Design a protein around this ligand. Structure first.
Ligand code: NAG
Lengths: 579, 4
């Protein structure tokens, strides 16, 4: 009878259900498409073609009507369909969407906003059915997206085009090209791209524009750049030439990075940023603010006993207020960015900060997949941060899980529920295999290299709690057979789920997690024997105990020597505990 | 292959 509102990402700021919903007709009347945003219309056209919905030549009173346009379009038929709702009073990228009584109206605050209004439209429609809603929506953070800045195998050309379509659909508006192991980015930054590399760049810039993504071209000259004299001039002119050749293809955002280098000449670092900001960014007139990261970029490396270190203090003293400055939080890879941490760093820089969030990146621990949600990021961080980006994994497809939640966190920050965002991410990306993918991904959220790098939601916490509850019940001689039978089910389910994934996941996802899927099936088997050891020990049956103990050690040995790493502190640790 |  009634059309429910489906999963939405990101969560729209304001949504009221105003009716029962209706079915969109075979063909629709399209109004406002001549004056509306070129890219928004295209995104709408593609969706309609895919879903077999034609567009009428002349108006049909029986057909569903769709009206679209910006605030600054003079289209009265649009304001008429919005029913007193407006985008006029919303911040940039905001939109209004109303659907009632056979009409759908999308008014964006600007072009970007109209595009995003279409994305929400796309998510609302299921089998030609749409709910009757009144929506107004806008981002918490104005810059949201991805910095490809990890070490290891850079994403393929095909990887990036697919990512950009994915960002557009989830209202992320920033992609920073800064892969560490691209020679022309870092190692040999002075050298121009070959012609065929420039043609690939061109395709990326185009696709970025088509999806309202600000393509940021990054460059990391900090290894061997000279600062003084004729050499400093030549080296600066190399930055201009490189940035020019990309401006001339349509790049309007630029980054200059100083992370992970020997040279800690703070004054000369900023002196370069400022000159580029003057002679290039401001001179061009249509270039977004310059983005950077200092050589000291985590609170630990930046601050000492409440006060900034020599590098940080001179860097902030010199760098122009308009330049976006990035930092990673309390550590390079850390549990939290508490509100107080952003307050301190934002204080030192007397500006709104940018976040380089190092998750789900796995370059420091390539055996594990980071498949968790945004976690430990304070929900009031928008107070000191106006620019938010995640460093993803070298595995592009599986990075989508974590990025999906980053879209929701940075768009609607104070509403962000991490467990709900995580569940929705997998529900939306995995369809039929969502339930099983959750079982698997649930064990692969926490990242820990045992030394300097810790981050992410803890692995399968409910299962960890049940494991701790067992040891307590056993060592105090309480009855445990209710919990044991419950745990057998869990471990069997882990095995059942992973086998179903191996059988049914499409290649693009499977070729990125198959080794870890194998690792978890093994541990699930080691856990089952661990229980068998517990049961036999209670039964005082040495035959069944020793038999199970060998099976358990056999699984643990497979896991400890294999490249793939998963569920260290839970499924793996349980076997170790039982021995 | 990583940050220090
Ligand atoms: C150092 O840390 C991460 C993790 O190894 C790495 O991906 C990144 O390229 C480096 N820089 C920053 C600013 O995090």
């Amino acid at each position: 009878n009634q059309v429910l509102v489906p999963n939405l990402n990101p969560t729209p700021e304001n949504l009221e259900v105003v009716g029962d919903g209706f079915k969109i007709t075979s063909s629709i009347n399209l109004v406002g498409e001549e004056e509306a945003d070129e890219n928004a219309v295209n995104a709408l056209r593609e969706f309609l073609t895919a879903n077999n919905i034609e567009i009428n030549s002349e108006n049909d009173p029986n057909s569903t009507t769709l009206i679209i346009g910006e605030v600054d379009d003079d289209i009265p038929e649009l304001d008429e369909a919005l029913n007193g709702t407006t985008a006029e009073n919303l911040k940039e990228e905001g939109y209004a969407l109303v659907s009632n009584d056979g009409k759908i109206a999308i008014e964006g605050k600007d072009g970007d906003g109209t595009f995003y209004g279409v994305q929400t439209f796309k998510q609302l429609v299921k089998e030609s059915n749409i709910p009757e809603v009144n929506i107004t929506d806008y981002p918490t953070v104005s810059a949201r997206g991805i910095v490809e800045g990890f070490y290891g195998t850079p994403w393929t050309h095909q990887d990036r085009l697919d990512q950009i379509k994915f960002y557009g659909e989830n209202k992320l508006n920033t992609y920073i090209y800064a892969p560490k192991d691209d020679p022309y980015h870092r190692e040999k930054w002075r050298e121009p791209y070959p012609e065929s590399e420039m043609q690939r760049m061109q395709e990326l810039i185009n696709a970025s524009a088509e999806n309202k993504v600000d393509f940021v071209f990054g460059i990391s000259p900090g290894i061997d750049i000279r600062f003084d004299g004729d050499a400093g001039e030549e080296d600066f002119n190399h930055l201009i030439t490189k940035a020019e050749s990309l401006y001339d293809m349509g790049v309007r955002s630029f980054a200059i990075y100083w992370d992970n280098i020997q040279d800690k000449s703070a004054a000369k670092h900023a002196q370069v940023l400022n000159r580029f900001n003057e002679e290039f960014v401001k001179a061009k007139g249509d270039v977004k603010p310059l983005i950077t990261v200092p050589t000291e970029y985590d609170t630990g490396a930046m601050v000492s006993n409440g006060q900034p270190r020599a590098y940080t203090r001179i860097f902030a003293e010199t760098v122009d207020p308009s330049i976006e400055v990035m930092w990673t939080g309390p550590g390079v890879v850390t549990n939290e960015i508490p509100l107080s941490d952003a307050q301190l760093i934002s204080g030192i820089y007397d500006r709104n900060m940018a976040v380089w969030w190092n998750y789900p990146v796995t370059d420091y621990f390539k055996g594990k997949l980071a498949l968790g949600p945004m976690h430990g990021l304070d929900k009031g961080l928008n107070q000191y941060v106006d620019f938010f980006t995640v460093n993803p994994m070298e595995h592009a497809e599986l990075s989508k899980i974590s990025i999906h939640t980053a879209a929701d966190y940075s768009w609607n920050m104070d509403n962000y529920d991490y467990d709900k965002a995580w569940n929705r991410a997998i529900d939306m990306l995995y369809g039929d295999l969502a339930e099983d993918m959750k079982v698997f991904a649930n064990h692969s959220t926490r990242m820990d290299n045992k030394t300097w790098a810790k981050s992410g939601r803890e692995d399968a916490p409910e299962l960890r709690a049940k494991m701790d509850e067992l040891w307590n019940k056993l060592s105090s001689k309480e009855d445990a057979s209710a919990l044991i039978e419950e745990l057998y089910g869990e471990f069997a389910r882990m095995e059942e789920a992973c086998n179903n994934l191996k059988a049914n996941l499409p290649e693009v996802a499977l070729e990125e997690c198959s080794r870890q899927l194998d690792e978890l099936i093994t541990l699930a088997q080691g856990d089952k024997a661990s229980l068998d050891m517990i049961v036999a020990q209670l039964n005082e049956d040495t035959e069944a105990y020793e038999s199970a103990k060998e099976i358990a050690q056999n699984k643990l040995n497979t896991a400890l020597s294999s490249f793939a790493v998963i569920s260290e502190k839970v499924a793996q640790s349980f076997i170790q505990e039982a021995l | 292959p990583s940050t220090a």
